[PDB]
Design an enzyme around this catalytic site. Structure first.
Site, PDB file in Angstrom:
ATOM      1  N   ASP A  35       0.851  -1.185   0.000  1.00  0.00           N
ATOM      2  CA  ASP A  35       0.000   0.000   0.000  1.00  0.00           C
ATOM      3  C   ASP A  35       0.884   1.232   0.000  1.00  0.00           C
ATOM      4  OD1 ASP A  35      -1.892   1.917   0.286  1.00  0.00           O
ATOM      5  OD2 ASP A  35      -2.419   1.405   2.341  1.00  0.00           O
ATOM      6  N   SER A 199      -0.589  15.654 -11.925  1.00  0.00           N
ATOM      7  CA  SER A 199      -0.825  15.320 -13.310  1.00  0.00           C
ATOM      8  C   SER A 199      -1.047  16.594 -14.142  1.00  0.00           C
ATOM      9  CB  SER A 199      -2.033  14.366 -13.408  1.00  0.00           C
ATOM     10  OG  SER A 199      -2.422  14.112 -14.703  1.00  0.00           O
TER      11      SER A 199
END
Ligand code: NA
Length: 330
Positions: A35, A199
């Site tokens: 994770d 992004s």
């Protein structure tokens, strides 16, 4: 040193991925959910409340000649999905794919929430976010990666998740055979303890690319792609009959649909998520309403590039002094 381990989807939907991890001496192999959005290595154990264990493999520290109680240390964690676990702490030898750390904090669960009990395939979590998020008190502990780092050939690990197939976690090296083209690296903020990056924009299907900054985290422990409501509405508007369902808890779409791809930007590069990756199947067994893999992050307070996004790429988690992320197509 390096390590290399195969990671395997837990079910036909890629809801999560499990990686075998050796703990203790002699080894006890547990299948852990790696994770990148958390920083605790915790396991089902001989200490876990018996009614909360249903099929998981447990770690039994009393059977490990290298286990030592980390006296007075406790832990307690709550995840973004509402799940939680807590317990006490041992140090022990932990190996992943041939890479061994001695003295790793192994957080033994005394209590787990219902979603953990109900998932017999996940024996615990291995956190790979920054150690500043580790929950052990009163002495915060390091992740497996942070303890391994100085021994690695390169201070990196890579995630290569499969679509309905096994993939790989590598530690300490880039496998230049595992991706196509070049790796585009992008800046990381560690201020929230995550692999947080920005992004450069998105496109829906064959549509034009929208240049827009989307801050979010690279999180292998989250199944879906959670993005701003504007972006998600633009995606599902291209699917006839898709809608946001308050009753179901997100966007659903007709199971008869063919989904468009979704592209996200990494600098000047582009990662394309095929439409198929965005189908999470019937909302309930036999339903013709299917659950979407792209969902709104509104109310979550962060955008999450979960497995839907990451499994479209070869992802480099660069833990050099200034961390960075890398993405390549594959
Ligand atoms: Na679900």
């Amino acid at each position: 040193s390096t390590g290399s381990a195969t990671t395997t989807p837990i079910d036909s939907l890629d809801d999560a991925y499990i990686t075998p991890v050796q703990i203790g001496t002699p080894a006890q192999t547990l299948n852990l959910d790696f994770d990148t959005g958390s920083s605790d290595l915790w396991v089902f154990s001989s200490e876990t409340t018996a009614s909360e264990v249903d099929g998981q493999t447990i770690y039994t520290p009393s059977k490990s000649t290298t286990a030592k109680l980390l006296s007075g240390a406790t832990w307690s964690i709550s995840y973004g999905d509402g799940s939680s676990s807590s317990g006490d702490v041992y140090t022990d030898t932990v190996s992943v794919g041939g890479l061994t750390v001695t003295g790793q904090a192994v957080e033994s669960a005394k209590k787990v929430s219902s979603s953990f009990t109900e998932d017999s395939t996940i024996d615990g979590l291995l956190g790979l976010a920054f150690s500043t998020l580790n929950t052990v008190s009163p002495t915060q502990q390091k992740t497996f990666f942070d303890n391994a780092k100085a021994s690695l050939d390169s201070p990196v690990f890579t995630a290569d998740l499969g679509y309905h197939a096994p993939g790989t976690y590598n530690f300490g090296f880039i496998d230049t055979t595992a991706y196509t083209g070049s790796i585009t690296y992008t800046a990381v903020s560690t201020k929230q303890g995550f692999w947080e990056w920005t992004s450069t924009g998105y496109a829906v299907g064959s549509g034009t690319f929208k240049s827009t900054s989307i801050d979010g985290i690279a999180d292998t422990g989250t199944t879906l792609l959670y993005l701003p409501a504007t972006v998600v509405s633009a995606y599902w508007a291209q699917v006839s009959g898709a809608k946001s369902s308050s009753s179901v808890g997100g966007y659903v779409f007709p199971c008869s649909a063919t989904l468009p791809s979704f592209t996200f930007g990494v600098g000047s590069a582009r990662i394309v998520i095929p439409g198929d990756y965005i189908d999470f199947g019937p909302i309930s067994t036999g339903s013709s309403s299917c659950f979407g893999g792209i969902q709104s992050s509104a109310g979550i307070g962060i955008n999450i590039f979960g497995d839907v996004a990451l499994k479209a790429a070869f992802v480099v988690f660069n833990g050099a002094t200034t961390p960075t992320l890398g993405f390549a197509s594959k």
